[PDB]
Design a protein around this nucleic acid. Structure first.
Ligand code: ZN
Ligand code: ZN
Length: 922
DNA sequence: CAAGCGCGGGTAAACGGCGGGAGTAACTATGACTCTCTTAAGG
DNA sequence: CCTTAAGAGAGTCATAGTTACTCCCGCCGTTTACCCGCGCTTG
RNA sequence: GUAGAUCAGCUGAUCCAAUUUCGCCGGCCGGCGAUGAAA
């Protein structure tokens, strides 16, 4: 008889109806879950602020009471009677007395840099002086990007919308240029704040050892200097040290190397307008390299605050995000009030007054020389916007802190330390007895509080210190999530109406179903739930983008995968959804590669070395990533993370991930650490198609055509190389995988070899194909022959020698300082171990004796033992032979690229044989 | 100087946080019962 | 002189586990709406 | 008609093919630069 009032469904009992609303109709039951606030319990933060206000009030006046405390506390939300009845409590009066007591207290270097600066200045002066054609233009653009700064073209394609900004210099310059030019009027930090913050030598000559000890990824865009990676790599380390010391002592860099080319980058996948682009600054390469060493020095010498884990976020978002999920889950399980403010400091990197930064650096203990250098550098900052090959008039910066400089994120860390210390001390969440207040990600700040008044006080504190620093707290992207349980009913509930005011302009309140992201992670008022299946759109964007099949596979390999498994890891996903995602990815790859549907699953997800296509399968690589990232939580130096590890939700997720990884991996022999690569290798070298693909593991270069060298193979050539590699050729037996009720004519060779029509039969022993076989053979031997004549060998192919036994035909011979070069070329099957075939071909030459003496007489080598027979063997699937690999690596000296290209030749010859057979199929 | 108002001690009569107890809608793992595909050796 | 009695790999789908909730009863600690004055102000 | 082919009704769409635009040094012809997203 019980029926829902929102879905008119019938349920046997009211309990089932209640859970029905809770799962089916969240918003209205959330409204029905709002608690009455008649006699709200007094939480510790209210006690603290009440006692501190009385302490001050008193000290300043001598005698005060609730009638004055209402005036001093407008938004406290407690009546004049509640203040009195609470005031009489003994711990409170003692705590007031506690705060009352506390409150009552080389010429060559010069020449080379002159040449480089002259070249840069010449370049600067020169720079200062239909649907079908639309697609062909996108092809030119995307290819010219993809062979360079690949993460550019990749992001541009997964968000493929002709993503070259678009909004134009116009609409951009009108938005940002006034902001970038307007000098902040920040008064600076008040002495009280500096005293609160108060609760180490940097300037020193550079060292070459630390110059090489500095990591620096050379895969970096130049600036407007026109100094690219290569010419700065040409600069030696001692010269680098000399110039760095010169600039270090002088304190100034040549003007040319301090310019910028500001470029605009979206934050959300769909750019709504000019207010969604981060104006990143790109300076010279030499400046960036010099600055990264100082950045490391400052990071090591002066570690940040304990609660500051945002500028080490290369592997630091793992802790902040994990702790956030843990605290949200804890507040849900034990029904404890929790207010979380997600404040945004985007655009705050360009609103830090130099007048406010210089003295903050001065009074933090930094040396005067360093402060002066930073002040000078930021005083003469001049950028030139560039969008889609169009460049603004020069713009003079007036708010400093360039989002693309090595020091910018650590020089902002001191402002972060100030603002972090500004907040009240005893405000936050007691997660497992440990107090957590702010997980300050470099960009997204987050404030945690127990009660409304404490959260509002923290908001006011951050606003005040931001205003003193000149920082503007944008009220658009910032939000507040409130979790106020209903006592006496054990119902969790979230507020809806806006309550907290960030210096006025009330903030947005998130709710049960509204989706929000704290640094790209799906979130909600209940916690991390799931991702919104944007993979389909990304795959579609890749498919329509003008890419070759190898470039699509590489983008899917390296860029989309990590991008989305980051959120997958921080998310909560069932393995069924991971399986569906894996299937979708597999089908998309099949469409891009024209592979049939009978290809084994392991082929896609096997490692490159093992012969597969990589393509990290989420179903197995996600539990591995979760286990790897959450194993060290219990050993985290930061105590809050250790406390969060105790939360049952994290433990449950870790247990589930361990189970899945155990099911989908094999224990390595050496490290005794589970690995999925072994799992996919074992599965791949088990199926009928993959059985021949066995010796690839022992030979590293055999598969170097899949990922390393897949830049010279054409799209058609690549998609047939992949077809042949996994034996995708549609022979009768291959097509018989499902249908064998037809007569054995349909199972037997088309040309009439009266045997089972196997693919190997087609390539290697069908009569017609013989021709193509020889065409491959010659090709191969000719190719490796050239190697001899770039290794200084007197080569000669096919020795026409008639031994007493008969007419044995060697492939090539050569000579250089002795050492026989009796080399045989073989392209073999894969059903027999390549090493035994190599031995069988080797012994029939070396142990012949008569042939040995014959070739010795032909070459004229003085000693019969001075010769050395050998054969290079590779299966038609393109797998090298280990013994031959070492043989031509060691004896007949050769560089590895030459042996790297042989598989390409072998695969090309094999598929050429197939196409020849198919066109003489008659 | 008496009456009125702001400033503080006392009472007590509903909030509310929690323990104990019995359940279930909605997914979400499988255990296990049905349909296809595969190497040889011995009298 | 070719087989053939077993092996070993998924299937929609049935069934059980599990996850995140539910509502009722009762209990003691909490909180603040009144009540009762004392000290300063005002007529 | 497309850089080329192909499926369509001079136009559209798909490809295993597909280097667009500007400046410059020069002879419709060659070469160079710009067209180069963070740490
Ligand atoms: Zn309903
Ligand atoms: Zn044949």
């Amino acid at each position: 008889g019980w029926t829902c009032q929102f879905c008119e469904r019938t349920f046997s009992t009211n309990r089932g109806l209640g859970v029905h609303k809770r799962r089916a109709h969240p918003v209205e039951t959330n409204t029905d879950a709002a608690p009455m606030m008649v006699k709200r319990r007094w939480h510790g933060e209210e006690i603290d602020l009440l006692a501190r206000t009385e302490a001050r009030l008193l000290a300043e006046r001598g005698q005060c009471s609730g009638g004055d405390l209402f005036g001093a506390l407008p938004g406290f939300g407690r009546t004049l009677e509640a203040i009195k009845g609470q005031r009489r409590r003994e711990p409170y009066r003692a705590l007031v007395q506690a705060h009352l007591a506390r409150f009552g207290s080389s010429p060559d270097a010069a020449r080379v840099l002159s040449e480089l600066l002259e070249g840069a200045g010449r370049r600067r002066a020169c720079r200062a002086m239909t649907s079908r054609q639309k697609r062909r233009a996108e092809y030119a653009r995307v290819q010219e990007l993809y062979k360079k700064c690949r993460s550019r073209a990749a992001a541009e394609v997964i968000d493929g919308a002709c993503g070259g900004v678009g909004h134009s210099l116009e609409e951009m310059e009108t938005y940002w240029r006034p902001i970038l030019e307007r000098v902040s009027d920040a008064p600076g930090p008040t002495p009280e704040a500096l005293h609160a913050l108060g609760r180490t030598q940097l300037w020193k000559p550079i060292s070459v050892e630390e110059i090489k000890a500095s990591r620096f990824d050379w895969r970096t865009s130049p600036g407007p200097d026109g100094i690219r990676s290569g010419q700065w790599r040409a600069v030696p380390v001692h010269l680098k040290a000399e110039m760095f010391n010169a600039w270090m002592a002088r304190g100034e860099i040549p003007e040319i190397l301090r310019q910028c080319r500001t470029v605009f980058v979206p934050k959300v996948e769909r750019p709504g307008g000019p207010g969604e682009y981060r104006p990143i600054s790109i300076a010279s390469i030499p400046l960036r390299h010099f600055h990264s060493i100082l950045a490391r020095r400052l990071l090591a010498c002066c570690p940040p605050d304990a609660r500051q884990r945002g500028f080490i976020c290369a592997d630091g978002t793992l802790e902040n995000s994990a702790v956030l999920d843990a605290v949200l889950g804890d507040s849900r399980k034990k029904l404890r009030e929790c207010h979380v403010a997600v404040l945004d400091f985007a655009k705050a990197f360009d609103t830090v007054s130099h007048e406010a930064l210089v003295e903050l650096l001065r009074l933090r203990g930094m040396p005067e020389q360093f402060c002066g250098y930073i002040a000078h550098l930021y005083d003469t900052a001049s950028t030139t916007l560039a969008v889609n090959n169009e460049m603004s008039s020069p713009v003079k910066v007036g708010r400093g802190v360039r989002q693309g400089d090595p020091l910018s994120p650590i020089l902002f860390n001191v402002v972060m330390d100030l603002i972090l210390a500004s907040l009240p001390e005893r405000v936050g969440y007691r997660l497992e007895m440990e107090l957590v207040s702010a997980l300050a990600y470099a960009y997204d700040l987050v404030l945690l509080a127990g009660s409304k008044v404490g959260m509002q006080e923290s908001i006011s504190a951050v606003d005040c210190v931001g205003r003193q620093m000149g920082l503007r707290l944008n009220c658009r992207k910032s939000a507040v999530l409130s979790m106020i349980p209903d006592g006496h009913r054990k119902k969790h509930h979230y507020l809806t109406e806006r309550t907290f005011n960030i210096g006025g302009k009330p903030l947005r309140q998130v709710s049960c179903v509204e989706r929000w992201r704290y640094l790209g992670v799906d979130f909600e008022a209940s916690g991390c739930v799931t991702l919104e299946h944007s993979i389909s759109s990304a795959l579609n964007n890749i498919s329509r983008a003008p890419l070759k099949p190898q470039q699509r596979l590489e983008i899917l390999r390296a860029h989309l995968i990590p991008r989305f498994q980051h959120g997958f890891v921080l998310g909560n996903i069932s393995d069924d959804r991971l399986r569906m995602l894996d299937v979708q990815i597999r089908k998309a790859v099949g469409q891009w590669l024209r592979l049939p549907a009978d290809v084994p699953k392991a082929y896609y997800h096997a490692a490159v070395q093992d012969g597969g296509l990589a393509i990290p399968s989420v179903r197995a690589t996600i539990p591995d990533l979760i286990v790897r990232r959450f194993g060290g939580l219990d050993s985290s130096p930061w105590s809050v993370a250790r406390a969060a590890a105790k939360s049952d939700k994290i433990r449950k997720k870790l247990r589930w991930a361990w189970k899945q990884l155990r099911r989908f991996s094999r224990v390595d022999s050496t490290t005794q650490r589970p690995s999925v690569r072994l799992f996919w290798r074992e599965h791949l070298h088990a199926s009928v198609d993959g059985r021949e693909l066995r010796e690839s593991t022992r030979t590293p270069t055999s598969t170097k055509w899949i990922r390393e060298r897949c830049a010279q193979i054409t799209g058609r050539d690549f998609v047939q190389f992949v077809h042949t590699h996994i034996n995708a050729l549609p022979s009768r037996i291959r097509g018989s995988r499902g249908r064998r009720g037809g007569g054995e004519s349909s199972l037997t060779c088309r040309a009439g070899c009266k045997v089972r029509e196997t693919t190997a039969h087609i390539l290697q022993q069908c009569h017609r194909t013989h021709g193509g076989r020889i065409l491959r053979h010659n090709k191969i031997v000719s190719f490796v022959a050239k190697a001899m004549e770039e290794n200084k060998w007197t080569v000669e192919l096919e020795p026409r020698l008639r031994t007493s036994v008969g007419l044995r035909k060697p492939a090539i011979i050569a000579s250089r300082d002795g050492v026989g070069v009796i080399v045989d070329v073989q392209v073999v099957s894969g059903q027999r171990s390549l090493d035994e075939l190599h031995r069988e071909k080797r012994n029939k030459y070396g142990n012949h004796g008569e042939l040995v003496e014959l070739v010795a007489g032909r070459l004229g080598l003085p000693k019969a033992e001075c010769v050395r027979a050998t054969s290079c063997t590779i299966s038609w699937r393109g797998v090298w032979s280990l013994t031959s690999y070492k043989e031509l690596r060691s004896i007949i000296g050769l560089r590895e690229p030459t042996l790297q290209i042989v598989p390409i030749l072998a695969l090309r010859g094999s598929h050429m044989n197939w196409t020849r057979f198919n066109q003489m199929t008659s």
